Every structure is written in structure tokens, then in C-alpha cells.
Symmetry: D2
Subunit: 485 residues, 4 copies
């Protein structure tokens, strides 16, 4: 694989002729993303992101296209790739390359390396394209990450450079780990300090998802976080809105498009009851499902029980479930022995950021036979028991793989937060050390206020006497730092 | 257009090569349709529909496909068309023509005249193909109808043949009415008693939906119901499950695939609160929408308010609605004046059986301009205000237009009812007069019990003393007027 | 046990002094019962119930009080008793005897024989007083019944008079069957045709509840229904609102006042899923309960499953239920064997019309020991296992036992239905045979319209073209007779 | 002038000691629904961690609180109690606490309680002073257990006025309760000049149970006036996200039911505030078929309300259409006289926040509206100028405890397990604390949730070693980062 280059723009996508359809959907989404449109208006004259060379790794969807065109409206240059092999919306990839005033013959947009249905090798090739700016002396200077893959390639790449060697992989390492190290080992043959110089140049990363933020905390603990990070997942207007209400919308959409399976009346097992598992359980309850939940954390478990759900183990419940969904952010939730315990024509999916919640390696090597039904839907049959299971998106996050991910108006909260985090890190970069930060409460309130307004809600304004009573300013922030909402 | 013919089967569909894909979905659907599979097993030996020549007008979906193959398993011959221009699922139509054991080169299934995105003239052409059996002495002898268009073609066609003329249309008559009359008028130039002869041969009709049943009541009140009918829509296991729970599933699905618009937080206006409007409001509420409802019937309105929804008129709430769904079975619910009042980028769709709940004709001649976004999704802009509305399925039923209609496990209730009714009408035909009937309660209980078992529910069995106390048999459990 | 007499009114109640308190609540109920108030206004001049002498057997609550004073406003005379030993609200009984313009020393309302906490003997004594008008030439001429006990005393009583004997009770007939047969046998010693004369004089009965209507069909099938009946339970505005939304309100109220037990997080078993069971499950699910449902009817079971509830048997689920509610109208749902299987401190109650859904007789003779906690709440302990169960209302309907029954705005639908039925049977009496009838749909629609307006709902008016398309009158009725709403 | 009753050497003031048998039956039922407290009694029985503590507790004297007090004494503490609201006490539970599990009304074996349902303001502050004044002048209170901060306010303001040498006069337009509070302090200062200072000096810490009290603690700490360590129990995860939310989902509708019996389904309901209590209120009403709108100042909470299906509206625009109006803000001046006069005829008005000043009751009472009492804690106020009447619950005091019985035992077992642990931590590890507001470590909140999951029969999954390593947590927890919001 080699990049296409048209009118001086390098990229790799499914089909540039999808641009007109992508544009139409982008325009509809701008009307549903007031957080982004408000930032474009507010920062238009200032051009806060001038001089930024942002390397972005985030599902290449309609919603992300409105984010990329906000970063460029605000002065940044970007290069983009998806953070999952199935999450790209090819029409939005084409509209980003062509830009709002370009055409497929005369594209005026930005470099995108993303299509729906990548292989592992192609995913990592695309991530290196997205991180590799064309002037050796102007490498990337910011990262915008969802899941931490862009940050991992940079920091691991530098670690192996400083060690003088890319380790061999073990035979029993996951396939993707072998691909990742192959990419790094190969580049190190011909370029000995690429990643060190990129890490040096990067002024900060913004990280969008609970899984990526866990990895940031694990780099910071090891003394390896080489630039400041803003944990955007934990903006109040991201975690409590995207993770929860986003998933309430998009889980059932993925299930619907993949399977068309009636949800009402079915037993549904949701593994994990954090913000995503709360959204899943709310979606399924609302469609008439009989929902049970698994958990390791007794606080979240007590919430599930308070919300009308039994709290059970996968060992006890797996044989009775019609639909099983993993939502933990952890690995090894649904192992091969659990899959072989499922009832005939049960459905299995994962909505967590990575596919290793479901033992797909074990399933693929087990001797079960696969019939592909349609893209991202496979029927796996075990000849020993006779039973077949429907697996969505090969265990990758099913809302993006089987449908279109969260809706624009939800993503307007997450991406307003991301945009503000990118502005803060770029323009006030000296104020940040090499640690993980969260945005101040006032800026999350700012984001929520734009969306209340857009939905026609009417905020009450505190009187002077009331503000004094609460010990807050009339304009906020209104809550203490540890407030949980 | 003329029909295609291959291996002795006449048909008109989008693409035979889709049969493989459709067959994989049909097989998964069979595991989700225990009502139909239970009937295939029960009646396999008896072959109750041997001799039946069933003309079917019903959305050509994966679910219909399992129904069609249950009829043919039971001994019937069939010819099929969709009952809407956008509701066909092309891979299902291909699998039905090819059959379980056929191939696209050598198909071995049954005649289907159906594709997604028919024009009006093509829809009525296909309906005439579906009702026209190849041997003139063996015309259709049963109809299986959803919405009454097959029934109306036969009964109106006979009416004109008896009058000796097909009347002209009026200039202000609907476009679809002109097409319908053109078909009948054209045919009556070469064939003077085609529909009269079909009418005579048809032993009965089964009708699947609320709008179709109203039309049967209207034919029957005019003294024009020429053959018996079973109202399948009003089986308990149909109206209270398909119209309500089916729509709870498929309305969100249609809206999602057409628009990907967040439902939570939005103001949603549902017009009508019968079983389909009750399923729409339950779906929307479940996604966190702020739902209001319109209604003419004070009983249904009081239910909506007891279920946590304001009951408002279109005039008062149209200006602020983010999504508007018509679910009435009536006409003229969202007129052009209301559409001009909508907020920018609001969404408008209909889930009733016919498009005339929304004033599409008014919209198409208003001076608003259309941009097609993707199939069945159009953006209409009024330049005087600058505001745009997203219209789903050009006003046609959005769950089947924009998505896949109700899920198979729901359609298994409706289609087990329709298969029982076809059986009852065909094998006990002399017991029925020319009136509309509903299935006895015990046959509805039998369809419910197949699905409770499929879901793992555990029924209690009455003791002899309890059965005596209630005055029921241990095996129907409710009075005839019971409402569930 | 003899009636009290004051200012020309015979009555038996707890305490006349409660009349002021009762009257304040009656006045507030009148604002919440626009169905009854609209009927008082409508028929004020006509006086349609002039000449009626209505014997009423119906829970003597604040809601029934507004019904009683609507019947008297329309010209009827009345004599009343409760239809359950624990459902009376003493301050309502006192306001009804005193009247809107009386005082406790000089009452000016109507005969009431009802108090909360009757014995069985007192219950049947009161039922006889209510059915026994003072002038033997003017016996009762209508019955207004809820549960059919008034109707049963009249028709069985006549039945024994024509046989010339009241049959002896069997040793293992229920305690209340013996009481009932003792009343009739004692009266038959001094009066040989009392019940025969009342039955001849009764021109109609209106029957308010599912269990009463069932008994009406059983009388009718036997050839023994001596006068016309209107089944008020099966008014659309009764069954689908009182039985369902009434119960959604008053089930949790009963369990709250009896036990104050958290409902959220708890496993709750609802026996029966008709309109009452549907309201129970909806109330419990709304409080975060984990609800399962039992059923004999596959159609109601499939609804419960489609509404997110497992459908289980008592035997499978009884051991782990924290709250068990019987809602069937049948008998022998929770037997002694099931109660010994309950978890310690589980709560057991019945909301169907009669206590025999729960095997109280078996409990009372089991060797378990009772400790009364407060009125209508008892703790039963089995010393063999050490476990105790909380029993509400000694098995009698708990919403009225432990709390105040359905709220006034619900009872306004049921009681406008019952007032219209009394009007129709009394004024159009020649139109009816000795069969059970239901009110015409337009009278149900009229009752709904009054409450829609009271809540501020805004009905759409059909155009002439729309009414022609539907084949309906613009003024209704709007649905076919078999429509199920 | 009230004086304590003294029986068998126990000083108290309650409605009726003969209710103790009925109280005890309800306490023993509650022990079965309070596994958090029963587990702590078993765990710390032998240790007696609270020996030497003299805890002055100010918290709604309900059945649930009685199981908390008996947990504190089981663990070695001595106590003296009072309610933190004039209508919240459950007289049978007050009687059972004085009599104790082995005492009788003639021979009580319990502890000093100064609480009954229906106190006047004067009696409420008299009772608060009894609760804070231990009998040995040389053994004053050494811990405070507070809900709403009233006990902490009397001690800290009492000491402030002592150090100043004067209790300030009240302003004519000060609220009535403020005039009572200063009267109490001004009178005691006449005869005892250092009472509150010695108390403040003896108190080793306070635990504070509610969002209102915790605000007041932050306000003392801001001003340099928090004279001893405080633990904010409100903000334990298993308190704020359980009690505030699911407790209120149960008890709001209970209080509305017992006061009014008004159908909730089909009514328009206005909830003012969408924090944890307003979320519980809206979930309760939604589940009963109400049509709910929400008011809010905070755009984050408002956006959650809209995402959960509720319009976000101002009181000015929605007040005239509301059938029921509930305040759940913790602020003051939410529903003013002008808004009351705007309500529809026979609308219901109540407050569920800790203090009654959310509803302008002073303005209502001085307006010229006429009051008819319907029954305890239910009043019908009529405006002769408009002809409209409104039903007001609990004279504006928290309606779940005033009109019903407050949150259910099983919910309070979380709050009171937290409070009991907080009291153990502050008494036994006192040198580890400065004069600041603290929250309990996350591991202890997990411990409390786990007792309740187990009691409900939920089954927790156990992390494998590999999973624990992947997450970077211990298999035994804690499982979430410190800023985790659940
Ligand atoms: N799309 C689908 O999958 C699907 C499924 C089942 C039924 N249907 C169709 O949906 C439609 C409704 O079916 P149903 O079973 O709910 O019928 P219904 O008769 O039970 O309900 C329709 C409701 O609309 C109300 N109504 C009529 N005119 C109105 C007006 N002008 N404004 C407001 N409300 C009005 C009526 O009072 C009635 O309660 C029919 O056309 C039916 O054939 C579609
Ligand atoms: N307490 C109240 O205020 C109140 C209100 C309305 C009705 N009622 C009473 O409630 C009872 C139920 O009324 P309804 O209108 O719901 O009647 P219903 O006939 O609509 O429903 C009862 C359900 O019980 C089911 N059932 C019968 N026997 C059973 C068994 N052994 N196990 C499981 N399920 C069984 C039936 O299948 C039926 O669906 C009647 O006694 C009625 O008079 C009480
Ligand atoms: N439509 C979408 N476009 C871009 N990102 C999305 C979309 N839906 C979900 N996500 C993001 O995917 C992340 C997990 O990789 C979540 O943190 C969520 O914000």
C-alpha cells in the first residue's frame, strides 16, 4: 500500500466520489453540532490553532469530519486516521479529503488514511501515515487520540529507539501486537530516531476515551508520559453524556442493523455497569428487554440492582442470554468456554473500545466454522454441540462497526470538549507539565450551556442573594470539584 | 415492463444474485419465527392448503418470505407483490423466487413481482401480475392482503366491468388514483370480465392491517364484500403485539437509518395513540425523548396522559417539534401549512399504512425545493423562510422504507395468525358468509403460547378447582370482549 | 349489635366526630372528581334517580362518599355498607352520615353501616342493614355492588326461601361461608319471603369489579340472574384506567404504609398480569424493582415478557421473592407450602377483590405464630425454620386495607361510569332483559372527555372529510365495538 | 418553659414512652433491612472502638436513626440525641430509643432523646441545647453527628459570640428561627460565659450527613472557623448516589400520597433542581405516569434532565400550569409568594430540600391568605383576591419525613454505615486529621456497597490476576480513580 496523492493531498480512502454524499451528511450534522459551530464562530478571528500540526487518531465518521473541519477553521493543519478498522464512514472520509469547497478532481481538504474494513496491517500503516508529517523538520506537534493508539506508537517507538532495538514478539502474543512491533522494527531499520523526534515535537495529546485515559495513567505512572495530556473522557459533558446517552442511542442501532433481532421479551446480559453499560442497559430496558448485568465493582453493581437489574456472573447467566454485550474496557470477559455455553442463535457483541473483551482469537482457532452473513455479521457454528452464535463486527465496537456510532448532537459535547482541550494545550502550553489534566469545570459548563440552549431548555439565573447563599458566582462554576452529577 | 421467466417461474425483481444473501437471512429468521415453523411441522402431513392459489399483496421482506414458504410448505401455490413501493427487501424477494433448493440460474421458488423503489405505475403493474394466474380457468382463489389494495383491485375492477365502463379520473384526483383507473381501463379494452371471474373464484381474503380492515368494513357496509374476509389485524396476538411492540422496535430503526438523529432530549410529536402510536411513544420515551401526542379519541388521549405524555394539537406543537411521526391511519394530518411552520432540520415521517397522512402533494407543488440525501431521505427547503425539513420515505411507512420493518419474532405472531386464517378460510370455507370475521380466541391463545415457550416463559397450569372457580377450561381464559 | 339512630337516620359507624375531617377531604376530592361533579351539574334539574332506593355495597372511602352524594344530588335515596372489613375510611363514613349540612349531633346525610376493622359477623350484619329498607312496602329497588356480595345475599337468600330451607354449613366450608349461612338461617326463622320480596323489587344492579362481574355471569349462566345488570368493570374508562393506573398508584401506597420497605433493588413477584397485575408491575418497575410475573393465560404472559418481565411460576420464584403480590381474582395462589418457602422478612399481600388468593386459613392453623405490628400488618413466624413473613391486611385487598385505595381522580372514571349505569338502568328500565350488559361506547367516551379536559389535554377535532374517511361521526364514537385500546 | 423528664436516671423529652413496644417491633424489622449497620455491630463488637465517645447527635429521630444510635452504643459510645427537623421524628422510635432493647417504659435502659413530631421552633432549639449539654461540666460532648449542620452551628456561633463578649441583637426582618436561635444563645450567655468555647474545645470531630450541612461546613472552613475536623458523609459515593437519589425516589411519592392522596399519573409536575434529590424526585414521578418538567441553574444538570425526557423550564413560565410543585434545591427563595399566587386552584406545593426556606412560607403566612388545617402537616391556603386555594405539605419542611417516614431502612443502611464508619475513623484516628473537611476513602465506600449487594443477592464477579493487572487495580479494590463519577 502506498498513499494516493491528488492535487498535493496525500490520503488513502475507499472512494473519493463519495464526497458529495458525505458533504450532504456533514452539512446536516453541523446543524446538530452547535458545540462545534459555536467554537468556529467564537475563535474565527483569533485563529488559536495556527501553527498546529495535529495528528488525529479517531473513528473517521461524519461527526469526526465536523471536528476536523472545526480544527482547520481554527487554523490547524491536520493528518487523520481512524482508531478502529471498521468505524470509518467512507462518505465522511471522502468529504474530509475534498473539503467544503473542493471536488473529487480538485480536492481542497486534508490527508485522511481511513476506510471501513481495514486489515490489521493496513490499520497500523494508516496510523503511521497519520503520524508522519511530510517535512522532516516539521513533525507532528500535537496528537488528538481516541483509545491511545497514536500515543502508544509514538512513546513505544521512542522507547525501542532509545534501547537500540525493537523486541521480538512471542508466538502467543496477539496478532495485532505482532503487526505493531513489525511496523516499528521495520521503520527502525532505516530511521533510528523518528519517534524520538516526533515525541520531542509533540506539545500535548488530548485523549477522548476511558481506555485511552487508562493507558495515559499507566504511562504517567511509569515516568514515560513525555508531553502533557488532557483527559477529555472525564469532562463532565463527555463521560456522563457520550458514554451513557450516546451508547443508549447507538447500541441498539448496531444491533438492529446487524441482526434485526427483536429486543423486547429477550434476555440480555450486559457486562459492566459504568457509563457505557448504564447506557446499554437503559437502551435495552426501554425496548422491553429483560436485562441482567455483570460487575466487579460493588458500587456500580448496587446501582444496577437499584435500577431494576439482577447482578449475575457470566458463568451463571451465559446459557440463558439471547444477547450478550461487553461494556467493560477490560479484557477476557467472554471466553471461548462462555461462547460454547451460549444458546443456539444467541447474539454476541462488544461496545468497549478494544475487541479483546471477547476471546475472538480463541473462537477463530477453536474449530468453529464461520459463515459470513453480511459485512460485520458472522454466524459461527460449533460442530460438537450443533449451536451457532451471531458475532457482530468480529468483536470490535459494534455501534461504529455495525451502524454509525453515536449521533451528531451527542458527539457535539465530546468534540467541543476535545476542541477546547486542543486550544488550551496549544495556546497555554507552558502552563502544563508532563501529567494528565482535566478541563476546568467552567469550560464543561460552557459546553453544556450551548446544548441546553440548542434544545430550547430555559436556565434559571441565580439572584445575587441566592449566589451568596450557595457561595457561587451567578455565572458559575456551580458545583464543587468532586461533584458527581 | 414485462415479466421475466426462468425455469417455469415468472417474476419481476431487482436482482436474482441476491438470493444467497437473502437465504442466509431467511434461515436466521426461521429461528426467530417459531409461530410459522410450528405451523409447518403441525400441518406438514395434512397439506391443508393443497389446491389454494393465493395472490399475496404484502411487503416483500425477509419475514414475508418465511410466511410465503410456510404457505407453500402447507400445499399452496402463490404469486406475490409488495403492498408498498419502498418496503421490498430485494435479497428476500430474490430468495423467494429462487427457493430453498434453487439457484439464480435455475430458480425453484415462486412468482414475485416486487423491488424496492417502484414507481406508482410499476406498483400497480406488479399487483395486476400478482392477481393474474397463468391459466384463465384457474384464476386466484384466495387473497392474502395487507392494506386492501389486492382486494380493492378485484372488487373495484368487477364494479366497473358490471357498469360497462371505467370512469375517468378528475384532474384533482390523486396521482395514484389515476394510475389505478388507467390499469383497469386499459385492461377493460381487451377483457370484459377478468375481475368478475377473479371475484367469483376467490374463496376468501385474509387482511393483515388496520387500514385494510377499515376498507373491508366499508365494502361490507356498501353490500360489496363479494367473499368472506378474516380480519387478522384484530387477532389479540396481532394488534396488541405487532402494531404496539413491532412499531416500538422499527420506528426508532427507520429514524436511525434515515437520519442518525439523536432522539434523547428531543421534542417528539406522535400523531395518534392507537396501538401503533402507543408503540411509537414507548420507543421514543425509552430513548429519552420529550414526547407529546395528538388524538381525536378522548379514551386514547386519556391513556396517553396517564402514560406521562401531554396531549396537544398539531397546530400548537408543530413549531417546536424536532421529530414528527404520523401514526393515525387517517388522512391530512400534517398539511403543507404545518410543514411550513416546522423548525429548521426537523424530521417528518409517517408510520401509518398510506402516505396521505402527510400532504406530500401539497409539499411537491409548494415551491419548496428537494435535495435527495440518500435513498428515502430528502431535504426540502423553503426559500421564503430558509428552513429545511427532512422527509422520510416520501411520506410512505418509514419503518419498512427506511429500515427493515418489524423484527421477525414479532412478525411471527402476525404471520402465524395470517397462516391460521388462510387455513380456516380454505378448509372450512362453507362455514363463512360474505362478512368480516375474526379468529376465535383459542387460536390466538395457541399462537401466544408458541412464543411464550420460545422465549422461555413458564406458564402456570390451573388446577381443576381453580378452573371451576373461574369457569374456564384448564386449556380460552377470557370473555370475548376482554381487552388485554 | 343494633343500629344507632339520630335525626331520623339509622347508621353504624366508628365515630361521628370525624365528620369535619371527612368533609374537608370530601371537598378536596370533589375538585379531583370532575366526572361526578359534571354529572351533578348535568342532571341537577332532571333528578333522574328520583324514586330510587339504592342499596350500595362498596368500600366506604372518601371517593365513595362523593359517589354517594352524587346519587343523592340526582334524587336517589341510599343505604350503604362497605364491601370489605378493612377498606372503610372512618372520617368518610362520618361525613356521609352527617351530610354536607348536618352536624354530629344532628346529622343530615344517609344511612351508613361501615367501619374500618369489622369482624366477619359485623360485616354481614352491616350488609343486611344496608339491604333492609325501613318500610316493608318499599324494599330496595336497585343495588350498586362491588364484588357481588349484595347481589349474592339477595339471590342466594331468595334461593333458600324457595327451597324452604337454609342448608347447614360443612365443617370445612370457610369461616365466612358459615357466617353468611348463619345470617340467612336466622332471618329465615322469623321472615320467610324477605329476599324473594327484595329480588322482586330490585330493578337492576350495577357491578363495579372483575370478581363481581364473574359472579354475575355465573348467576346468568345458571338461569338465576333475577334482574338486569350492568357490568361497569368492563367500561373502557373503568377496566383500563382504575384497574391498571389506580393500582399503579395504590399498590405501592399500601406497601409503603404497611412496611416502609424499599421497593427499588428488590425482587418482586406479581401473580397475574390482567389490568391489576399490569398496574402492579408498572408501579414496582417504576420504583426500581426487579419484577417477575406469574400467569395462566399465554396472551397476558407474552405481554409481560414484551414489557421486560420474566414469566415464572410461584414454585420457582417464591424462595427468593422479597415482595409477593397476588393480583388474579382466582383462589389458592399462595398456599401454605409456598409461604413456608419464603425468605425471612419477605412481604406477602393480595390486591385482588377477595382474600382467598392467599391461604390465610392454612397459615392460621399451621403452627406459625403471629405478632401484630400495627393495624393490618402482622409478622408470622415459623419456629421450625426461624423465618418470618410480613402479611398485609390479613390477605384482604392491601391498597384499601393498608392505605386509602385508588386516588380520587381515578375513581372519578369508575364512579361516573357507575352513576351513568344507575341512571340508565333506573330511567330506561324496560329496555333491559335479565342479562348482563355493558354501557355503550359513546358514554365511555363522554366520561374520558371530562377527564382529558380536567387535565388540560387538547383533543383534535376531525374535519368532515376525515370523519368520512374513517366512517365515524365527528362526535364519535370513534372505534369499532371490539376495539381493545 | 419545658424541662426534661427524668426516668431511671435518663433525661429525655418525647411524645410518649408507652410507644416503645411498637417502636421496638419496627426497630427489629429495620435491623433486618439495615445489614450495613448490623454488619458493623458484629465487626466491631469486641473492639468497642467508640468507648469514651460522648456523641451529640442531631438527625431526624426515625426508626432508621434509632438502629444507627443503637449501633453507636453497641460499639461503646454514649449518646445524646435530638431531631434535625421539627416534624421528622417518629414518636414510636424516639420511645424505643429511650427505653432500649432490654428496658421497659417503667424501667428504661436507653439513651437521652429530646425529640417529638410537631415541635415549635423554640422547642426545637431547647431540644438541640439539651442534646449538646452533657450532665458532667467536666465531660462535655466530644463528638458531633450532624445532619444539616444545626448542632455544629450552635457550637461554632455560640463560641464566636462568647469570644466577642456579646450575642448580637436580631434585626426585625430576620427569619423567626434566627430570632429563636439568638434568644437561646443570648440567654445562656447571661449565666455561662464559656459554655460553647469549652464544648468546641472538647469536640474531637463532626460527621455531617447532608448536602446542606456540608455546604455550611465548607463556609466555616473558608472563614477559618472550623474548629475541629469534619467528615463529609453526604459525598460518600454510597450516600449521595443512593440515599439522595433512590431514597427520594421512594419517599417523595410516599409523602405526597399520605398528605394528599392525589393521583400523580397524568398530572403536570414541576421539580425545582436536578441534583441527586431532584433526579430521584423526577424518576419517582415519571414512574407514576406524571408529566414532569424540571428547573435548573446549572447547565450540566439541566442537560441531563433534557436527556432524561424532561423539559427544562423557569418557575415563572410553568408555575401556573403545574398540578404539583416540589423544591429540591438546597437553595433559598425558589417558590416566592408571587409564584404561589400564580398556582392553579388546588395545586400541591411541597419542599424536599433540607430547609423550609426554599418555599417563601414567611411571605405566605403574612400575605393575608387564610389557612385551613386539613390534618397534621397538610394545610389548604386560600387567597381571597383570586379565590384560589393551594395545598401546602409540612409547612414547607422536608415533606418525605414530615408527611411520611422519610427514606426506607435499606437505603438508610448505606448512609448510616457511612456515618458509623466516619464516627469510628474520627474518634480512633483523631491525630491523623486537621481542622478541614474530609471524605472517606473509596475502599470504605466499596465495603459498604458490597454488604448491600450481598444482602440483595447480587453476585459480584472477581477479577482475575491478569485483569487486575490490565486495569492497574487490586483484585480487592479500590476499582475506580478518585475523580470517578459513577
Ligand atoms: N408501519 C407499520 O409497521 C404498521 C404496523 C401496524 C399498523 N400500521 C398502520 O398504522 C396505522 C394505525 O394503526 P393502529 O392499529 O394504531 O390504528 P388505531 O385505529 O388503533 O389507532 C389510530 C389512532 O389515530 C387516532 N386518530 C385518527 N385521526 C386522527 C387525527 N386526525 N389526529 C390525531 N389522531 C387521530 C385515532 O383516534 C386512533 O386512536 C394504520 O394505517 C395501520 O394499518 C402500520
Ligand atoms: N384492589 C383494587 O383496587 C382492585 C382494582 C381493580 C380490580 N380488582 C380486583 O383484582 C382482581 C384482578 O382483576 P383484573 O381486572 O386484573 O382481572 P383480569 O381477569 O383482567 O386479570 C387477572 C389475571 O389473572 C390471571 N390468573 C388467573 N389465575 C391465575 C393463576 N392461578 N396464576 C397466575 N395468573 C392467574 C388471568 O390469566 C388474568 O390475566 C379481581 O379480583 C378484581 O376484582 C382490585
Ligand atoms: N459517531 C462517532 N464518531 C466519532 N467517535 C465516536 C462516535 N460514536 C462514538 N464515538 C467515540 O468512540 C469512542 C470509543 O473509541 C468513545 O469515547 C466515543 O466518544
Amino acid at each position: 500500500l502506498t498513499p494516493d496523492v491528488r492535487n498535493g493531498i496525500d490520503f488513502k480512502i475507499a472512494d473519493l466520489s463519495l464526497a458529495d454524499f458525505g458533504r450532504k451528511e456533514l452539512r446536516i450534522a453541523e446543524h446538530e453540532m452547535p458545540g462545534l459551530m459555536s467554537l468556529r464562530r467564537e475563535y474565527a478571528e483569533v485563529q488559536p490553532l495556527k501553527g498546529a500540526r495535529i495528528s488525529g487518531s479517531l473513528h473517521m465518521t461524519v461527526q469526526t469530519a465536523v471536528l476536523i473541519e472545526t480544527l482547520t477553521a481554527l487554523g490547524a493543519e491536520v493528518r487523520w486516521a481512524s482508531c478502529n478498522i471498521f468505524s470509518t464512514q467512507d462518505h465522511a472520509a471522502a468529504a474530509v479529503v475534498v473539503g467544503p469547497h473542493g471536488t473529487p478532481d480538485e480536492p481542497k481538504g486534508v490527508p485522511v488514511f481511513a476506510w471501513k474494513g481495514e486489515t490489521l496491517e493496513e490499520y497500523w500503516w494508516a496510523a503511521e501515515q497519520m503520524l508522519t508529517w511530510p517535512d522532516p523538520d516539521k513533525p507532528a506537534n500535537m496528537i488528538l487520540d481516541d483509545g491511545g493508539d497514536a500515543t502508544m506508537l509514538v512513546l513505544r517507538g521512542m522507547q525501542y529507539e532509545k534501547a537500540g532495538v525493537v523486541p521480538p514478539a512471542e508466538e502467543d502474543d496477539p496478532a495485532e501486537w505482532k503487526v505493531f512491533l513489525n511496523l516499528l522494527r521495520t521503520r527502525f531499520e532505516t530511521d533510528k530516531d523518528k519517534w524520538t523526534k516526533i515525541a520531542e515535537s509533540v506539545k500535548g495529546v488530548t485523549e477522548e476515551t476511558t481506555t485511552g485515559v487508562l493507558r495515559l495513567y499507566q504511562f504517567a505512572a511509569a515516568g514515560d508520559l513525555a508531553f502533557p495530556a488532557i483527559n477529555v473522557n472525564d469532562s463532565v459533558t463527555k463521560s456522563k453524556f457520550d458514554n451513557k446517552y450516546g451508547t443508549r442511542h447507538s447500541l441498539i442501532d448496531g444491533i438492529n442493523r446487524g441482526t434485526d433481532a427483536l429486543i423486547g421479551g429477550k434476555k440480555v446480559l450486559i457486562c459492566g455497569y459504568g457509563d457505557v453499560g448504564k447506557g446499554c442497559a437503559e437502551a435495552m430496558k426501554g425496548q422491553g428487554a429483560r436485562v441482567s448485568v455483570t460487575e466487579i465493582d460493588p458500587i456500580n453493581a448496587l446501582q444496577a440492582m437499584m435500577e431494576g437489574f439482577d447482578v449475575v456472573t457470566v458463568e451463571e447467566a451465559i446459557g440463558d442470554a439471547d444477547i450478550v454485550v461487553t461494556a467493560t474496557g477490560n479484557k477476557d470477559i467472554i471466553m471461548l468456554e462462555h461462547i460454547k455455553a451460549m444458546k443456539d442463535h444467541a447474539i454476541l457483541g462488544n461496545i468497549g473500545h478494544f475487541d479483546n473483551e471477547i476471546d475472538m482469537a480463541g473462537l477463530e482457532r477453536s474449530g468453529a466454522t464461520r459463515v459470513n452473513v453480511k459485512p460485520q455479521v458472522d454466524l459461527w457454528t460449533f460442530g460438537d454441540t450443533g449451536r451457532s452464535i451471531i458475532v457482530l463486527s468480529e468483536g470490535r465496537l459494534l455501534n461504529l462497526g455495525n451502524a454509525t456510532g453515536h449521533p451528531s448532537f451527542v458527539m457535539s459535547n465530546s468534540f467541543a470538549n476535545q476542541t477546547i482541550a486542543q486550544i488550551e494545550l496549544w495556546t497555554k502550553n507552558d502552563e502544563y507539565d508532563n501529567e494528565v489534566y482535566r478541563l476546568p469545570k467552567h469550560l464543561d459548563e460552557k459546553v453544556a450551556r450551548i446544548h441546553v440552549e440548542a434544545l430550547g431548555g430555559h436556565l434559571t439565573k441565580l439572584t445575587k442573594e441566592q449566589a451568596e447563599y450557595l457561595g457561587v458566582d451567578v455565572e458559575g462554576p456551580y458545583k464543587p470539584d468532586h461533584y458527581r452529577y
